[PDB]
Amino acid sequence: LVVIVQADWNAPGWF
């Protein structure tokens, strides 16, 4: 849901 590390549920961040 953030921008750090590959990508989360939607956004390009897992952190």
mmCIF file of C-alpha atoms in Angstrom:
data_model
loop_
_atom_site.group_PDB
_atom_site.id
_atom_site.type_symbol
_atom_site.label_atom_id
_atom_site.label_comp_id
_atom_site.label_asym_id
_atom_site.label_seq_id
_atom_site.Cartn_x
_atom_site.Cartn_y
_atom_site.Cartn_z
ATOM 1 C CA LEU A 1 0.000 0.000 0.000
ATOM 2 C CA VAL A 2 3.036 2.344 -0.060
ATOM 3 C CA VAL A 3 5.986 2.837 -2.473
ATOM 4 C CA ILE A 4 8.853 0.922 -0.770
ATOM 5 C CA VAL A 5 9.814 -2.561 -2.027
ATOM 6 C CA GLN A 6 8.201 -4.084 -5.196
ATOM 7 C CA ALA A 7 4.444 -3.631 -4.611
ATOM 8 C CA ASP A 8 1.750 -4.301 -2.031
ATOM 9 C CA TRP A 9 -1.963 -5.115 -2.323
ATOM 10 C CA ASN A 10 -2.305 -2.116 -4.663
ATOM 11 C CA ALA A 11 0.487 0.436 -4.400
ATOM 12 C CA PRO A 12 4.162 -0.180 -5.419
ATOM 13 C CA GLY A 13 5.313 -0.566 -1.858
ATOM 14 C CA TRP A 14 5.082 -3.206 0.831
ATOM 15 C CA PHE A 15 6.184 -0.978 3.754
#
